[PDB]
């Protein structure tokens, strides 16, 4: 079960499109105690984004069915099944972040990466929260994005793709979770402009396409 065996079976799992497998591999890597290379870090992030992405999509389908009888009670119970799966996944990632990843990130860029992940999975918890439970989730997401944001401003170029990805997801958080288009647009626009002023290689396609991404959201929000 060596780190690099697991990394290789993880890469195989990705090519096979068996993402629960890939995530279990990368989880094992992470629990081994040591800081994650950029390779590992990215494999982890990809695995869990696909694992959770499937539940997010399924959840959406069944919610929008439930909003359109005993069939309606079927949709409700099934949605709660998917919800419990999704919640269990999210909290798995968040435990990994608090226990291994964030307290081990010596690269400041990784510290931003992990806080942004934390923002993201509290965001996914918030997409499906229902109650007085939801404020605390929303606060955890927003606070984690704000921490990531803050650090990225000191340690990162406005053109850096992790800084811009952090900006995109933060702005989406404001739009979808806080229903606040003004903050969403402000954050997005400030980041696009501080980027388009400093373009002056090899991660270029990343920045620009995230920039394109930022632009697109602006267009649909204004």
């Amino acid at each position: 079960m060596d780190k690099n065996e697991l990394v290789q079976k993880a890469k195989l799992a990705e090519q096979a499109e068996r993402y629960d497998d890939m995530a279990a591999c990368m989880k094992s890597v992470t629990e081994q105690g040591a800081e994650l290379s950029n390779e590992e870090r990215n494999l982890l992030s990809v695995a869990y984004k696909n694992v959770v992405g499937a539940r997010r999509s399924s959840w959406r389908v069944v919610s929008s069915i439930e909003q359109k009888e005993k069939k309606q009670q079927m949709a409700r119970e099934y949605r709660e099944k998917i919800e419990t799966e999704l919640r269990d996944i999210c909290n798995d990632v968040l435990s990994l972040l608090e226990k291994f990843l964030i307290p081990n990130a010596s690269q400041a860029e990784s510290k931003v990466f992990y806080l942004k992940m934390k923002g993201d999975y509290y965001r996914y918890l918030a997409e499906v929260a229902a109650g007085d439970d939801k404020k605390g989730i929303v606060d955890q997401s927003q606070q984690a994005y704000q921490e990531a944001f803050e650090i990225s401003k000191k340690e990162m170029q406005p053109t850096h793709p992790i800084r811009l990805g952090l900006a995109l997801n933060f702005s989406v958080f404001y739009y979808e979770i806080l229903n606040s288009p003004e903050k969403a647009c402000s954050l997005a626009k400030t980041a696009f402009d501080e980027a388009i002023a400093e373009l002056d290689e090899e991660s270029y396609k990343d920045s620009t396409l995230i920039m394109q991404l930022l632009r697109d959201n602006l267009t649909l929000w204004t």
Binding site: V46, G165, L213
Partner: peptide, 8 residues
């Protein structure tokens, strides 16, 4: 599309 960063 979705509005968030797509991390393949």
């Amino acid at each position: 599309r979705k509005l968030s960063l797509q991390e393949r």
